[PDB]
Design a protein around this ligand. Structure first.
Ligand SMILES: [Br-]
Ligand SMILES: [Br-]
Ligand SMILES: [Br-]
Length: 410
């Protein structure tokens, strides 16, 4: 009878994402014949920018694929997207680990549901480590000891792992959490949480790692975020014999190794006595509801359909990663779409099974912070600043960036 509801939904992706999403939408309309969905989809380029102007003028879509770091952009207050807590009758929030939802909560307002989550963990070149005669490290000391075994037994060009600056940042953060159980960012005070001495310690650990031949210094490899190592010869040759990176995108990296060598999942190094592995779990992307939607219930039903319903989940498959949704996981395992023997999947499973009560701030992902960190480690590697001067430099310049980024609500 009469009355129907017209929703708009955006997302970005390649044609492969477009096809399954378009397919999922058709299934949704089948089961909700009075709700139509107009799809607004492009590639990544220009997408944020277009959405930015829509959000500003209150003409954004009812349902949006969003990135985690858009919370600092659109929703410093938590009010930049619709509060998903207000539509829990349409949205089955129990399917998503409460802890993961904390990270997408701002000021007690749920701003998105992680479609999928991924953690930064260790994967190793199995051949190379067999050449070294080493078991993969279960402790930081073992990782450190591995650097010198690689150096003298295999050669100066061999390293246990190769690391982007940003990956190193996350790695040492992980160590610091294990030790002190505080986050890197103090959100409420809008500055870094570590003490001066802890900053000295943070960078002392970097120096200790490089001195111990754990990874190439920045004179040999120097990239902020771009995982460009996988196309380079020492990776392919098995000289850079491992990586610390998102579990979700491991296959591309492993296939570029000289066979029969592949990437296998490593243990996660633990300090003795720790109660938190200090893992970085990233919502790879989220679904959010437009702040200004005239249809929050139907938008909520669409999100619920895409993440939780049988034919929504089936359509969408693994085209946005392993779902966070519990029912989605169980369903995709039964159909054999999720295999526990996939290095990518087993890694997620290990990360989930490890203790990780410390969450991570979206402001931690700021590109200026990550760039600054490459600057900082270069000061150390190139002898231009002592570890202690670098810690004070990073603390100071970091705080300036944070302060500027954490104020200024659009
Ligand atoms: Br894309
Ligand atoms: Br240790
Ligand atoms: Br943090």
């Amino acid at each position: 009878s009469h009355m129907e509801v017209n929703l708009r939904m955006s997302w970005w992706g390649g044609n492969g994402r477009h096809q399954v999403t378009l397919k999922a939408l058709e299934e949704f309309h089948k089961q909700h014949p009075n709700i139509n969905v107009k799809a607004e989809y492009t590639g990544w380029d220009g997408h944020l920018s277009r959405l930015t102007t829509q959000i500003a003028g209150g003409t954004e879509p009812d349902v949006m694929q969003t990135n985690w770091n858009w919370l600092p952009i659109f929703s410093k207050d938590g009010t930049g997207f619709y509060n998903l807590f207000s539509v829990k009758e349409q949205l089955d929030l129990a399917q998503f680990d409460p802890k993961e939802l904390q990270q997408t909560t701002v000021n007690g307002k749920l701003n998105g549901i992680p479609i999928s989550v991924t953690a930064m963990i260790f994967y190793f070149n199995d051949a190379t480590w067999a050449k070294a005669g080493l078991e993969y490290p279960k402790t930081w000391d073992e990782l450190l000891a591995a650097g010198k075994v690689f150096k003298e037994k295999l050669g100066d060009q061999y390293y246990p792992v190769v690391l982007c600056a940003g990956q190193t940042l996350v790695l040492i953060r992980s160590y610091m959490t294990q030790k002190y159980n505080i986050p890197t960012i103090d959100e409420a005070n809008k500055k870094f949480a570590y003490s001066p001495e802890q900053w000295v310690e943070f960078f002392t650990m970097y120096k200790t790692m490089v001195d111990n031949h754990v990874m190439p210094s920045t004179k040999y490899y120097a990239s902020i975020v771009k995982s460009s190592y996988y196309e380079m010869k020492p990776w392919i040759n098995g000289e850079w014999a491992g990586t610390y990176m998102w579990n979700s995108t491991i296959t591309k990296y492993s296939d570029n190794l000289t066979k029969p060598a592949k990437l296998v999942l490593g243990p996660y190094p633990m300090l003795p006595g720790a109660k938190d592995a200090g893992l970085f779990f990233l919502p790879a992307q989220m679904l959010s509801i437009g702040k200004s939607t005239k249809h929050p219930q139907e938008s909520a039903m669409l999100i619920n359909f895409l993440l939780n319903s049988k034919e929504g989940v089936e359509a969408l498959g693994l085209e946005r990663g392993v779902p966070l949704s519990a029912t989605a996981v169980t369903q995709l395992r039964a159909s054999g779409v999720i295999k526990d023997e996939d290095p990518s999947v087993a890694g997620l499973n290990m990360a989930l099974e490890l203790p990780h009560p410390m969450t991570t701030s979206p402001y931690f992902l700021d590109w200026q912070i990550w760039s600054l960190f490459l600057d900082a480690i270069q000061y150390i590697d190139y002898g231009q600043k002592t570890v202690q001067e670098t810690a004070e430099y990073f603390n100071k310049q970091g705080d300036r960036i944070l302060k500027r980024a954490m104020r200024g609500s659009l």
